[PDB]
Every structure is written in C-alpha cells, then in structure tokens.
C-alpha cells in the first residue's frame, strides 16, 4: 500500500500511561497500536488516557476492537475507512503482525498535491 509508514511507533499492554505520554511528547503521535511482539492486540489513543492515572497499564485502557488494513489494499481504501470510521491512523497488518501504519494526516496532504498536480497535464 502506498503512503505507508514502515517505522511504526507501538506500545505494549504492560507499558504505563506515563510512558505513553512520553511517546506522545517525543514522536508527536496522538495514537499507537498495541502489540505483543509484532502481533496486533489493541489500539490506544490520546482520548483514552484523559484523566487516567499515570501508573495505569495500557492493557486496561486500550481498545481491543482494532480496525486495520492489509498491505494488498490501496491508500484510497485506507482513506475511505478512516473517513468512514472517523479515525486518524490505520495500522497495516499481515498475518496478524503490524507491518506499517497509514495516517489520515498524510493522505490529507496527498489530496492537496493531487489538486496541485493535474493542472500541468492540461
């Protein structure tokens, strides 16, 4: 899939809210896939850690319902899913293992250049 980031920032169910906030401050990501090794087990967002004690573990806060896409799908399918579900990031998994991630932020900038493009083709 195009517009896929292979350097995914993930967390484990045993990491604490405190360490996740440090990942947010470091990587500027507002959400992370939860993994056991590379196997996707959940998703966590900035909204989930609102008012949560910093010692709380991720596994008790994360959502186990995780929407994902396959590397065989296109960036336009991921854009459609993120627009339909209202989410800002979409993990890309293959055989249950996270192989990448697609952000709504990247595809929103990809739509702009597409409009900037296609005026040279006339």
């Amino acid at each position: 899939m195009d517009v896929m980031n292979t350097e995914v920032v993930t967390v484990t169910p045993e990491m604490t809210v405190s360490e996740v906030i440090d990942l947010i401050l470091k990587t500027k990501h507002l959400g992370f896939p939860v993994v056991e090794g590379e196997r996707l087990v959940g998703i966590i967002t900035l909204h989930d850690i609102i008012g949560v004690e910093p010692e709380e573990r991720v596994g008790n806060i994360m959502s186990r319902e995780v929407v994902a896409v396959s590397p065989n799908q296109s960036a336009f399918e991921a854009f459609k899913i993120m627009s339909e579900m209202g989410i800002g990031r979409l993990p890309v998994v293959e055989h249950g293992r996270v192989v990448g991630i697609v952000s709504r932020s990247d595809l929103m900038r990809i739509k702009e250049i597409l409009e900037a493009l296609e005026v040279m083709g006339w």
Epitope: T6, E7, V8, V9, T10, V11, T12, E14, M15, E19, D22, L23, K26, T27, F32, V35, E38, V98
Partner: nanobody
Framework: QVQLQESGGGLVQPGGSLRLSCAAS????????MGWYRQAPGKQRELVAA???????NYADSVKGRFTISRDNAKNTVYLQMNSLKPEDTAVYYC???????????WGQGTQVTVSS
C-alpha cells in the same frame, strides 16, 4: 547522529546459549528504544525483542522466555541473551533503534547466528 554496531554471534549447538551485543554511537542518539530483528534464509525480517529507555520489554512469542534483552543506558548498549537455542533460530540478527515497542528507524549491518548440530 545514530549508528549501530552488532557484536558476537556465530555457530552454536542446539540448546546452547549465545549473547549478542550492540553499541549505539552518534550525537543523535538520545535514549532511543533499541531492539533486535532477525531474518531467516528464506523469510522476511522479524522482531525478536525490544526495550525502551524506561526498561519496558517486548518479545516475539517464539522467543519469549528463552531470550532476554537488557540495555546499559549510560553506555547506549543493548544486549540480547539467547538460551535454549533451536535450529529455527538460525538467522541474520540486526540491531535496531527508534521509538516504541517495535523500533525500526535505524539498523546495523547484521550478524550471523547459526544453530545446528
């Protein structure tokens, strides 16, 4: 900014032990998460273990328990201790660095580990 240099590795008997080492250099390294990936002869790259600056570990299920990872924060060095090694553990082991439970931003040249009778 960031460079990784593997160390150790070689031929080991089935059920034996082996310790891999990796030192991170460069002014760009700043308590990054460090980990180990491996690639079997005919398979894709695959996570072995990883550890963050906070000390949080993450293991692939196939190596869980048999392998242990630790890191010296002052020396920017990560260690992978392997025990009860199996022939299926034979692969090129790459040292990685980045952020989170699966750091993939920077890579080393890799080191060979062969487990066979």
């Amino acid at each position: 900014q960031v460079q990784l240099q593997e160390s150790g590795g070689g031929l080991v008997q089935p059920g034996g032990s082996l310790r891999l080492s990796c030192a991170a250099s460069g002014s760009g390294f700043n308590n990054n998460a460090m980990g180990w990936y491996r690639q079997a002869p005919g398979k894709q790259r695959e996570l072995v273990a990883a550890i963050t600056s906070f000390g949080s570990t993450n293991y692939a299920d196939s190596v869980k328990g048999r392998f242990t990872i630790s890191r010296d924060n002052a020396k920017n060095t990560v260690y992978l201790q392997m025990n009860s090694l199996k022939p299926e553990d034979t692969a090129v082991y790459y040292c990685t660095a980045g952020w989170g439970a699966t750091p993939r931003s920077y890579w080393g040249q890799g080191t060979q580990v062969t487990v066979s009778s």
